[PDB]
CSV table of all heavy atoms in Angstrom, one decimal:
chain,number,residue,atom,x,y,z
B,85,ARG,N,33.5,2.8,6.2
B,85,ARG,CA,34.2,3.9,6.7
B,85,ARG,C,35.7,3.6,6.8
B,85,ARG,O,36.6,4.4,6.4
B,85,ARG,CB,33.7,4.4,8.0
B,85,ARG,CG,34.5,5.6,8.7
B,85,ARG,CD,34.0,5.9,10.1
B,85,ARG,NE,34.5,7.2,10.5
B,85,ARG,CZ,35.7,7.3,11.0
B,85,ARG,NH1,36.5,6.3,11.1
B,85,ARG,NH2,36.1,8.5,11.4
B,86,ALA,N,36.0,2.3,7.2
B,86,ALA,CA,37.4,1.9,7.4
B,86,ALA,C,38.1,1.7,6.1
B,86,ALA,O,39.3,1.6,6.0
B,86,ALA,CB,37.5,0.6,8.2
B,87,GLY,N,37.3,1.6,5.0
B,87,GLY,CA,37.9,1.5,3.7
B,87,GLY,C,38.3,2.8,3.1
B,87,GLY,O,38.9,2.9,2.0
B,88,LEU,N,37.9,3.9,3.8
B,88,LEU,CA,38.3,5.2,3.2
B,88,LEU,C,39.6,5.7,3.8
B,88,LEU,O,40.0,5.4,4.9
B,88,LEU,CB,37.2,6.3,3.6
B,88,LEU,CG,35.8,5.9,3.2
B,88,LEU,CD1,34.8,6.9,3.8
B,88,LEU,CD2,35.6,5.8,1.7
B,89,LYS,N,40.3,6.5,3.0
B,89,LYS,CA,41.5,7.1,3.5
B,89,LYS,C,41.1,8.0,4.6
B,89,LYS,O,40.0,8.6,4.6
B,89,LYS,CB,42.2,7.9,2.4
B,89,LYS,CG,42.7,7.1,1.2
B,89,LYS,CD,43.5,7.9,0.2
B,89,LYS,CE,44.3,7.1,-0.8
B,89,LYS,NZ,43.5,6.0,-1.4
B,90,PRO,N,42.0,8.2,5.6
B,90,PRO,CA,41.6,8.9,6.8
B,90,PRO,C,41.1,10.3,6.5
B,90,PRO,O,40.1,10.7,7.1
B,90,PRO,CB,42.9,9.0,7.6
B,90,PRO,CG,43.8,7.9,7.1
B,90,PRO,CD,43.4,7.6,5.7
B,91,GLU,N,41.7,11.0,5.6
B,91,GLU,CA,41.3,12.3,5.2
B,91,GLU,C,39.9,12.4,4.6
B,91,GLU,O,39.3,13.5,4.5
B,91,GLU,CB,42.3,13.0,4.2
B,91,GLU,CG,42.5,12.2,2.9
B,91,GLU,CD,43.7,11.2,3.0
B,91,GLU,OE1,43.8,10.5,4.1
B,91,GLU,OE2,44.4,11.0,2.0
B,92,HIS,N,39.4,11.3,4.2
B,92,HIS,CA,38.0,11.3,3.5
B,92,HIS,C,36.9,10.9,4.5
B,92,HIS,O,35.8,10.9,4.2
B,92,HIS,CB,38.0,10.4,2.3
B,92,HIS,CG,39.0,10.8,1.2
B,92,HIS,ND1,39.5,9.9,0.3
B,92,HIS,CD2,39.5,12.0,1.0
B,92,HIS,CE1,40.3,10.6,-0.5
B,92,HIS,NE2,40.4,11.8,-0.1
B,93,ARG,N,37.3,10.5,5.7
B,93,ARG,CA,36.4,10.0,6.7
B,93,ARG,C,35.4,11.0,7.3
B,93,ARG,O,34.2,10.7,7.5
B,93,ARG,CB,37.1,9.2,7.8
B,93,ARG,CG,37.6,7.8,7.3
B,93,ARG,CD,38.7,7.2,8.3
B,93,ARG,NE,39.3,6.0,7.7
B,93,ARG,CZ,39.7,5.0,8.4
B,93,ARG,NH1,39.7,5.0,9.7
B,93,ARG,NH2,40.2,3.9,7.7
B,94,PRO,N,35.9,12.2,7.5
B,94,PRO,CA,35.0,13.3,8.0
B,94,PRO,C,33.7,13.5,7.2
B,94,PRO,O,32.7,13.7,7.7
B,94,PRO,CB,35.9,14.5,8.1
B,94,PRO,CG,37.2,13.9,8.4
B,94,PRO,CD,37.3,12.6,7.6
B,95,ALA,N,33.9,13.6,5.9
B,95,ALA,CA,32.8,13.8,5.0
B,95,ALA,C,31.7,12.6,5.1
B,95,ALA,O,30.5,12.9,5.0
B,95,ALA,CB,33.2,14.0,3.5
B,96,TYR,N,32.3,11.4,5.1
B,96,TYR,CA,31.4,10.2,5.3
B,96,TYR,C,30.7,10.4,6.7
B,96,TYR,O,29.5,10.2,6.7
B,96,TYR,CB,32.3,9.0,5.4
B,96,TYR,CG,31.6,7.7,5.5
B,96,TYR,CD1,31.1,7.0,4.3
B,96,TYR,CD2,31.3,7.1,6.7
B,96,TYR,CE1,30.5,5.8,4.4
B,96,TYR,CE2,30.7,5.9,6.8
B,96,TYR,CZ,30.2,5.3,5.7
B,96,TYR,OH,29.6,4.1,5.8
B,97,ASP,N,31.4,10.7,7.7
B,97,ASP,CA,30.8,10.9,9.0
B,97,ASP,C,29.7,11.8,9.1
B,97,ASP,O,28.7,11.6,9.7
B,97,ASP,CB,31.9,11.3,10.1
B,97,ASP,CG,32.9,10.2,10.4
B,97,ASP,OD1,32.6,9.0,10.0
B,97,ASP,OD2,33.9,10.5,11.0
B,98,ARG,N,29.8,12.9,8.3
B,98,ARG,CA,28.8,14.0,8.3
B,98,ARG,C,27.5,13.4,7.7
B,98,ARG,O,26.4,13.7,8.3
B,98,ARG,CB,29.2,15.2,7.5
B,98,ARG,CG,28.2,16.2,7.3
B,98,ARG,CD,28.4,17.1,6.0
B,98,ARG,NE,28.4,16.3,4.8
B,98,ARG,CZ,29.5,15.9,4.2
B,98,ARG,NH1,30.7,16.3,4.7
B,98,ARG,NH2,29.5,15.1,3.1
B,99,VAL,N,27.5,12.7,6.6
B,99,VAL,CA,26.4,12.1,6.0
B,99,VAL,C,25.7,11.1,6.9
B,99,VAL,O,24.5,11.0,7.0
B,99,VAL,CB,26.7,11.4,4.7
B,99,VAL,CG1,25.5,10.7,4.1
B,99,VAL,CG2,27.2,12.5,3.7
B,100,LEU,N,26.6,10.3,7.6
B,100,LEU,CA,26.2,9.3,8.5
B,100,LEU,C,25.4,9.8,9.7
B,100,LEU,O,24.3,9.3,10.1
B,100,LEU,CB,27.4,8.4,9.0
B,100,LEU,CG,27.1,7.4,10.1
B,100,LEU,CD1,26.0,6.4,9.7
B,100,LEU,CD2,28.4,6.7,10.5
B,101,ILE,N,26.0,10.8,10.4
B,101,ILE,CA,25.3,11.5,11.5
B,101,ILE,C,24.0,12.1,11.1
B,101,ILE,O,23.0,12.0,11.8
B,101,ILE,CB,26.3,12.5,12.1
B,101,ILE,CG1,27.4,11.8,12.9
B,101,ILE,CG2,25.5,13.4,13.1
B,101,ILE,CD1,28.7,12.7,13.1
B,102,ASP,N,24.0,12.8,10.0
B,102,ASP,CA,22.8,13.4,9.4
B,102,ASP,C,21.7,12.4,9.2
B,102,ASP,O,20.6,12.7,9.5
B,102,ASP,CB,23.2,14.2,8.2
B,102,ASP,CG,23.9,15.5,8.4
B,102,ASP,OD1,24.1,15.9,9.6
B,102,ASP,OD2,24.3,16.2,7.4
B,103,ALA,N,22.1,11.3,8.6
B,103,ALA,CA,21.1,10.3,8.3
B,103,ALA,C,20.5,9.7,9.5
B,103,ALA,O,19.3,9.4,9.6
B,103,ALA,CB,21.7,9.1,7.4
B,104,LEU,N,21.4,9.5,10.5
B,104,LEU,CA,20.9,8.9,11.8
B,104,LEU,C,20.0,9.9,12.5
B,104,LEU,O,19.1,9.5,13.2
B,104,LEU,CB,22.1,8.4,12.7
B,104,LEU,CG,22.8,7.1,12.2
B,104,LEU,CD1,24.1,7.0,12.9
B,104,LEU,CD2,21.9,5.9,12.4
B,105,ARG,N,20.4,11.2,12.5
B,105,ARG,CA,19.6,12.2,13.1
B,105,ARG,C,18.2,12.3,12.4
B,105,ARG,O,17.2,12.4,13.1
B,105,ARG,CB,20.3,13.6,13.0
B,105,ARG,CG,19.5,14.7,13.7
B,105,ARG,CD,19.5,14.5,15.2
B,105,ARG,NE,20.9,14.6,15.7
B,105,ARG,CZ,21.3,14.1,16.9
B,105,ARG,NH1,20.4,13.4,17.6
B,105,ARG,NH2,22.5,14.3,17.3
Side-chain angles (χ1 to χ4, degrees):
Chain B
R85 178 182 192 282
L88 309 170
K89 297 183 165 52
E91 58 270 37
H92 300 154
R93 289 165 186 207
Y96 183 88
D97 289 345
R98 173 206 60 258
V99 175
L100 172 55
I101 287 160
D102 285 353
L104 285 165
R105 182 69 67 202

